[model samples]
Target: GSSGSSGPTPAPVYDVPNPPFDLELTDQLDKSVQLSWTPGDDNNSPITKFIIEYEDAMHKPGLWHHQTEVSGTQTTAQLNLSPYVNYSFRVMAVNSIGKSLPSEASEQYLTKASEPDKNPTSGPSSG
Candidate 1:
């Protein structure tokens, strides 16, 4: 009779989450907008959370700033916005190891101007 003399060794598996993809804006409103994207690979550990970043298109040499964060289970976020300004957004996936690379930026969106600014309280008719 003979017994096994060797045991199988498992390979290492550890890495940060992969970047999200297909970032898109939807359900735009006067003061808010919706962002959606697909999550990427989590490497070894499962995704823990997601971060949303945005930039003001009007600003020269714009910077990406943190907008909001959501649980890993969520793929969409309702972001607050201002009227008459252009904005761009991106998403990041995070796991126990670290945060993933930033996702592709969304198309620039120019929110609709406020209603009050479009209408005048009073006007004089003159030629």
Candidate 2:
């Protein structure tokens, strides 16, 4: 005796947050980089997870690898990438409803190992 006049049951609604923003490169090393972003409007549902991923010209299309994942309540991650190459990163925020669009990509980062023109002279001492 609930929906006797109703046509069909309405689908449950959700408060999916918008894509996370303010993607920034916090730190970088020879083989790793740290990133952080701001949480978008949660609408009504809280975030659940943040999918962290990276891509490069050499990784082949659709080959983006997941460096690490963060709690939806979190906004920081670290990616260990290959040295001597360029890479761009993006993040997706997953809410109780679903995943949001990817955040703005980071600038192309260069992490090449330093190669000196000549090795420094090493001497114990000149007495």
Candidate 3:
């Protein structure tokens, strides 16, 4: 038996969520720094990934780097940067349809841990 049948069509498109906004530094430790921001939503298309940008403060634009194609579900990330060096970072969200505007930049100053003191006088004498 031949019958005319067609599969269901896709739904109409809708507005997408704006790019993550209000970016800021959340945590800072001796070895790493954490970045956080607000999540974006899309009525039609869900976020697909996030792009993170960062670089050493002293390097200027020459050192500017980017991390793209990150999971959309992620709202925060930690970076292992050089110790005692200044760094600035920013992030943006993207979806299958398009990319949202980049979030505000966040700056951080990292300082390396100091070496332990070594003094022979502090130890007990064998006598």
Candidate 4:
């Protein structure tokens, strides 16, 4: 006669998901700006989408100006922003399992084009 003994099974192993993409403002042209980031690392469950968030200087949590989910392997995004506006942006990566913490916020200030002097104004006029 032969006898076998069973013990608690070992838990499954999974690769630790790397932090979400690192966001940055690549360029600012006219009233538009470019945003880019690195993709998350989770070969077993690679990121399926990205979450982009932004807000004005108002700092109101409920007043966020933009929040969107984008697909594809594209790692960069371009946003057409308003001139003279201050904005803060961040991004997050998500898979079927869950989403990683958002990346650090990137702040930017867009400036309007300089106005031309109307009457060929000279240097500071004497008061």
Candidate 5:
């Protein structure tokens, strides 16, 4: 028979992957910040997803909050976080197998306080 002695299929040799490198944060604007990171080792399995998590200056235990997720091809993301608060974030790489370990936390970032619009000139006052 065709199924006489075919041993069990081997498990997937692929891996989750390592965290991205050159992680950076910028665009500290009112309640928002921009982030970017370089791709990481995927162990043959192409990365399919990128996860973002962060925490505030409170430094509480197990308090990391889910910021957002992006396509593996995307290297940048803009996060809308609490204004006037300090924050830090980490990135993780995901492959078909599973999610990779999270990267190191980003440098301390302070969100900009609420400010007036830069371009608020609708007209020269109809006087």
Candidate 6:
């Protein structure tokens, strides 16, 4: 006789996680910054990862590009900062179903002047 206990297995269903909220910069440095946020619900399946997106508002207005990816267990990530750039950031959660909506854009972050070590080459030099 068969020793199976369960009659049948139920179908698996999964939905994308809710968007992470309250995205903000946790720490800022000379060439990088740390971002932390509150994670969203993963519906049925567990969250697999998080995607960090950035926008160059000064150069590429209204266009967002991928910055980096963070593991599911972590709610914070460190992103490299570019020199003399105006930037904003957002976050999205990913699960088995798909990616969730992006979180609200973070506050504007302005980078410092570029090339501090290099000598001035554009301006006229004093003789």
TM-score of 5: 0.70
Residue 42's lDDT within candidate 6 is 85
- Give TM per candidate: 0.74, 0.67, 0.60, 0.60, 0.70, 0.73
Model 2's alpha-carbon lDDT is 0.69
Pairs of colliding residues, candidate 5: none
What are the clashing pairs of model 2? none
Candidate numbers sorted by TM-score from highest down? 1, 6, 5, 2, 4, 3
RMSD of each: 12.7, 13.4, 16.3, 12.4, 14.3, 12.8
lDDT at residue 89 of model 5 (Cα atoms): 82
Q: Name the lDDT of candidate 4.
A: 0.61
- The lDDT values for all models are 0.77, 0.69, 0.63, 0.61, 0.74, 0.78
**Model 1 off-target regions past 4 Å?**
1-9, 28-30, 114-127
Between candidates 5 and 6, which one is better according to TM-score?
Answer: 6
**Per-residue alpha-carbon lDDT of model 2 for 8-80, expressed as tens digits?**
7666546576777777887745545678888788767778888877776434524567667788877878778
User: What local lDDT does model 4 show for residue 4?
Assistant: 65
Which scores greater on TM-score, model 3 or model 6? Answer: 6
Off by over 4 Å in 4: 1-18, 28-31, 58-65, 113-127
Q: Give one digit per residue, the lDDT tens place, for model 1 in 11-38.
A: 6576788888778878746556778888
> Best TM-score goes to which candidate?
1
Query: What local lDDT score does residue 75 receive in model 5, on the 0 to 100 scale?
Result: 80
Model 3, C-alpha of 96: deviation from truth (Å): 0.7
Better of 2 and 5 by lDDT: 5
Give every collision pair in model 6. Answer: none
